Ligand binder design. Structure first.
Ligand code: CB6
Ligand code: CB6
Ligand code: CB6
Ligand code: NA
Ligand code: NA
Ligand code: NA
Ligand code: NA
Ligand code: NA
Ligand code: NA
Lengths: 138, 138, 138
């Protein structure tokens, strides 16, 4: 029923060559609308602070709620975030707006992918909506 | 006399397969009791925020107090934390509850170990108590 | 006209073998004086918090202002900081007080250098003043 969508650093700045022209507020609106259509309730949060992201992951773990996570640059760097996410009992779907495999080599490594249920990259902001649909059909 | 025990991200969540069933509050109690038995005063702090950890390390450097540090995932990732710890004039003992050498390869690298006095891993929460005893006998 | 000088973790602690004996407050004074002589206004900020640094970079991007950045240990570790800096339309000059190429191997890699206009290392705190002079003559 409840799905948490958590966005990490810089994703508040959305709005165009690499990440598209959709703003973060528009993304929240699109996600909330799609969730409603699927019979879910999406709670969307964004922070540039790793400690804040960790707290939101901890809350999802305590509530046994699924998470759709776009960790931004922390994807490639944060073991702390990986360890928080490893506590999740419900599914974790990693989303990247851009195709990280077509960019710098450092972006092709994720600490999160090995512990995620699955990963969607390169499908733009529709990746979040597709992640929701996965969760609704499961 | 005063020893600072600093715990990094996710260690507030303690309480069981990998890290044991002892909670962070219980750990603080056990450490305070052992410190008292050894004639020390332990000040135990935990944060998921790297900036907060840095501030506590800075304070220990200014006070010339020893530190027992379990940096959590930041062990493997944070040069900033290493540099703060390199300022410490009193001993630094790195502690890990789990045997990081028996886990993923990324956990086998520490930015802290080269600048620590010593390192204890895999002995559970008793590692903190053994670190205290080292400091008391030195 | 306005130049932002942003200092990352531990740089508040300046004041001597590796980084010199000039304190952060003295550095701010020296930078402000040099900026005035060059007809610039320098805004100098320091934080141990990556989220705070990101916010200051975001502000510079929105204002189309140049940045002189000494990211401290985050130089070697933070993709999030690199991505924020990649948004800057005005020049980015990376400065390191110490000669990072004469130190540990991990310090010889920077996420920032590939997206910076240029990089000054090893010239002490004069590196900041030289960065200002570059910006004034450009
Ligand atoms: C105006 C602006 C300026 C810089 C940046 S950086 C950013 C998102 O950071 C990241 C997101 C990814 O997760 C993705 O493709 O969704 C890839 C990851 O490598 C990158 O750090 C969004 C964004 C927006
Ligand atoms: C409920 C729960 C869920 C996830 C996590 S992660 C964690 C501590 O993080 C780490 C601690 C270590 O320092 C250690 O063995 O003490 C190893 C380090 O690799 C790891 O990130 C504790 C903890 C507790
Ligand atoms: C009292 C004290 C104790 C520890 C530290 S660490 C620090 C700055 O950190 C860094 C700065 C550099 O950017 C540089 O040469 O300016 C190099 C970088 O590798 C390092 O982390 C300044 C500082 C001051
Ligand atoms: Na929630
Ligand atoms: Na899309
Ligand atoms: Na203390
Ligand atoms: Na134990
Ligand atoms: Na400014
Ligand atoms: Na100098």
């Amino acid at each position: 029923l409840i799905v948490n969508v958590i966005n990490g650093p810089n994703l508040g700045r959305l709005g165009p060559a690499v990440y598209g022209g959709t703003t973060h507020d528009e993304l929240v609106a699109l996600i909330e609308r799609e969730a409603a259509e699927l019979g879910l309730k999406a709670v969307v949060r964004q922070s540039d602070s790793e400690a804040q992201l960790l707290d939101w992951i901890h809350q999802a773990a305590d509530a046994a709620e699924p998470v759709i996570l776009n960790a931004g640059g922390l994807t490639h760097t944060s073991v702390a975030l990986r360890d928080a996410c490893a506590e999740l009992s419900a599914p974790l779907i990693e989303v990247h707006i851009s195709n990280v495999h077509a960019r710098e080599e450092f972006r092709r490594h994720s600490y999160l992918s090995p512990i995620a249920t699955g990963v969607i990259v390169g499908l733009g902001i529709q990746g979040y909506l597709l992640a929701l649909r996965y969760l609704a059909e499961h």
